[PDB]
Symmetry: C3
């Protein structure tokens, strides 16, 4: 199939889903495509945004810190049930695409940007597994190991192949193909540590942490040098950079679980995430220039994971300065989801513009 050199020279845009002014495609543009062909793999971001909020709201209802508010536990029950409904629908609809349009899927699997989104279905399931409502699992001492193996099996199996082609001469190297959204494949390992520690296997959790950190360091520095991938890193500051915060925030939570309390290895990761958050939200150009797009839902994923981590920090350092920080980050992140949630409905049933023709999968081979 087409390489990424032909995917970086015909598609331009921060997410790279936009045809340039010279390229030619193989399908009619004005004509309406079949619904299945117009269903991109970027719709899984909806599950990521909703699932993360379920984890965050549980912390506000069970954590010893932030207790005076008296947050009822029904928020997690309502959010968790609704989140699962969407996941069972997007996954079911996508499967039909593979059976009837397996040819189109292979095009996305080679897309430089959409490759890393294949991990979303497994990551989303993990969040709903480590934040199950207390009502459904009363007297829960330790989760059965089967949950970890089933959901951490397919991820790890596909983990080896992608990670193994970065140190090679094949075209798909970390240098030839890379982008700000490349962290989505290295965040599962950190998130998987929490699930493992909740089933009884503690040594295994340490294994995932080492794997996650080693690749994150490589994937972090590589996005500061001159890499063949051009037109992907947006000029100035763009929301696509929010994925930088997903990794450090998740890593900090993992350490607090295996080793019980914040060591020097938990605060430092948290402080790195906080620095990036300030440099991406403490700007008057962030709350003024906003355009609704499907990719936005995926950008709330790292702005909500930080809120979960910050609450844990406030638990080990009680005080007014810490409470304000924890109770303010969780408000900005939750506010964005509410705005996005209302906006999506209007574009679905009022304007009918959520699923336009996907011109990024119709680039002709060669020139």
């Amino acid at each position: 199939n087409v390489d990424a050199g032909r995917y970086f020279a015909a598609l331009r845009g921060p997410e790279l889903d936009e045809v340039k002014d010279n390229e030619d495609i193989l399908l009619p543009k004005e004509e309406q495509w079949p619904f299945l062909l117009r269903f991109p793999i970027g719709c899984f971001g909806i599950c990521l945004g909703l699932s993360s909020q379920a984890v965050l709201w549980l912390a506000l209802a069970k954590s010893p810190a932030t207790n005076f508010l008296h947050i009822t536990p029904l928020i997690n029950l309502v959010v968790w049930l609704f989140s699962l409904v969407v996941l069972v629908s997007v996954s079911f609809t996508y499967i039909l695409k593979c059976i009837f349009y397996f040819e189109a899927v292979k095009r996305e699997y080679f897309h430089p940007v959409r490759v890393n989104f294949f991990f979303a279905p497994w990551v989303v399931c993990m969040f709903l597994a480590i934040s199950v409502p207390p009502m459904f699992s009363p007297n829960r001492k330790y989760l059965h190991p089967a949950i970890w193996c089933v959901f951490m099996g397919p991820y790890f199996f596909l983990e080896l192949k992608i990670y193994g082609q970065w140190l090679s001469g094949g075209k798909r190297r970390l240098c030839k193909v890379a982008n700000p959204s490349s962290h989505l494949s290295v965040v599962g390992n950190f998130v998987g540590a929490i699930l493992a520690s909740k089933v009884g296997w503690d040594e295994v959790a340490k294994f995932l942490w080492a794997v996650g950190f080693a690749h994150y360091l490589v994937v972090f520095v590589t996005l500061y040098q001159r890499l063949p991938t051009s037109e992907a890193l947006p000029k100035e500051l763009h929301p696509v950079y929010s994925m930088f915060i997903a990794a450090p925030s998740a890593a900090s939570i993992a350490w607090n679980t295996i080793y019980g309390q914040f060591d020097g290895c938990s605060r430092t990761c948290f402080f790195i995430a906080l620095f990036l958050y300030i440099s991406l939200v403490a700007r008057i150009n962030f709350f003024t220039g906003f355009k609704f797009s499907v990719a936005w839902w995926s950008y709330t994923f790292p702005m909500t994971t930080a809120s979960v981590a910050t609450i844990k920090y406030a638990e080990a350092v009680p005080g007014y300065p810490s409470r304000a920080l924890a109770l303010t980050l969780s408000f900005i992140s939750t506010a964005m989801v509410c705005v996005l949630f209302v906006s999506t409905l209007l574009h679905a049933f009022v304007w009918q513009t959520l699923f336009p023709n996907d011109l990024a999968i119709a680039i002709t081979k060669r020139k």
Copy 2:
């Protein structure tokens, strides 16, 4: 204004302040320029060299180790007072340049090498703040927080903008623009930790350490790969490389303050700094080939900060081998300052060659 691609293709030299044999300038060469236009931003290195010695001499007079010598405390009093006099003069003179020659300053602010020297004024003030003579501050329990905020405010505010343009598509990236003297912008955070810990705020000090380390790692590796910046890294070994030692040495001192005693996180940073020091001074080509230049004063900054760190190491591991190391590094560094101090006076009033025409700010736009 001119970019750095036009600043890396018309200026050649280790510090990059020297016109090539083909470029044309916009100002007369033989004619003497106004004094203000001939006052470069590189003169702030004088304050850095003198201020650091004040910190080092205090350690030799208060530290439990190195006590048999019976070093009087008057050395700090004399050095500290003289250091402040120079700072109040260079800063005052430079300010007049901005009012009358703000146009010239903007040229320096875009210079690939002189950009990182804007942090010197704030870093110099910190050294004189964490090494105040005991006489002036008797019964000193903890410094007022106002000192940290006032001096760490302007640095952090300008910290976000430069650090934020490295991960972007703008011309000023860590790859397009970089050089051995790029560590001067990542050393303030480590130095700022010491000041914060001396006013009562200890958690804040941890925040700066994480920020400092994250950027240092990125700025360390990036100077080993092939980066568009050419003609800046001198062939063979050059004194400009001494800035590599400023970062690790300052970081080690910070850890000893927040966490009290040398953990594994303090010795390892110290040993990295020691290795670089040996590879840059254990050479017969270092003490034989010496040419007086203004940039030399800034090269003593990292050769004196190590002496402060080594004394702390000798405090936790008493013994003859440690005492010799601490009492020998502080002698080489102090000897260079004395030689430079005498040499500067001769070039100021005997030869009158300290401030020649600055041809590096007269490069014509384009070709």
Copy 3:
């Protein structure tokens, strides 16, 4: 002498010892060269493979874990004596080459790949020093310091020059010259820590660890970016990549010695090494496609050092899952040595093809 730009444009092959289909050489091909000229520096891999096995077998005979097997100590005595015999022969034969063919040696010293093999003679001696049979050294409390200085002297002295030319403008930089086998120069420091800790000097061991880690991180990331060195990184997966495991495995053992027990700093390094091992041996393409070559002996070096580290891990976490892992890795690594040992003899006296003409040292200057 010839640079590496002329060594990367006339030699092609995973180890780079194979002339391309267009280059011209300066010596007859059909004619048989003198035996000395046909003796490459790659023969030292034999000592590395045999010496490592001596260390591993000692652990199986003294370590509290893996005791039920009742492994006799005579295995170490027989292997150690035989290993020393080979070392005293290869070293003696090579020395004669320098006296009579010093001109040829300089060509190898500038070879991009064969430069890092000059460290083998010193590394091999260390293994036979930290694994001396108990019979030869009864009532051994601490080894004399002279052993460390004699064997760690020449390595460190040559350590400074190579490490010092990576951060420079000279042709031999980490970017212009690099390859998967570049870890052989950064593994001595980690191995040298164990020897130092066995003579009484413990603080010195910490110094080597910091030096080893700092260069390994630089040498690790640099092999993921686009570096002028092309045709050296084999396409797909190749055994040359096994050198990635030598560094982390050796580092983990060092920490367990200086600080007594596995901290968080030992398990994490071990887990990184384990991940790389799985991605290079858990493949049906590894045990099926095998071709005998001299470079193979050097590839068993990192597959045996891991077995030594894993046994130590099983000592701190007793249990059936740990015992199986330790007793299975040491079987695959030892099996390969037995297969290679038998194969080498046949190619030496039955087929007579171990030392063919070395065409890689006859590349004409320029084109």
